[PDB]
Design a protein around this ligand. Sequence first.
Ligand SMILES: *[C@@H]1O[C@H](CO)[C@@H](O)[C@H](O)[C@H]1NC(C)=O
Lengths: 49, 49
Amino acid sequence: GKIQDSLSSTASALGKLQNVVNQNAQALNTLVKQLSSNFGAISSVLNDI
Amino acid sequence: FNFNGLTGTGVLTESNKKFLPFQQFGRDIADTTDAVRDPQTLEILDITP
Ligand SMILES: *[C@@H]1O[C@H](CO)[C@@H](O)[C@H](O)[C@H]1NC(C)=O
């Protein structure tokens, strides 16, 4: 009973899994955000140039 | 589709999201060209490849 109450109430104790997910998401975002970079060119769109 | 500045390939569908009269082009958190305003008929279209 105590452990089920503790799991129902407190939510941070699951961070051991939660962090994992966050990490993965972060990477993907950066990767996508890497598309909008000039890299020294005149535009960030292949169709544009 | 070539909407006066944009060559590309995507499905053009009808949108329901509100647009400011000054705003034409739309983006996302993944900063991709999502929506567009047709010049002939002032209609808002979503692009989905
Ligand atoms: C452009 O011309 C066509 C034909 O004359 C007309 O139907 C259309 O309404 C015009 N565009 C605008 C924005 O009025």
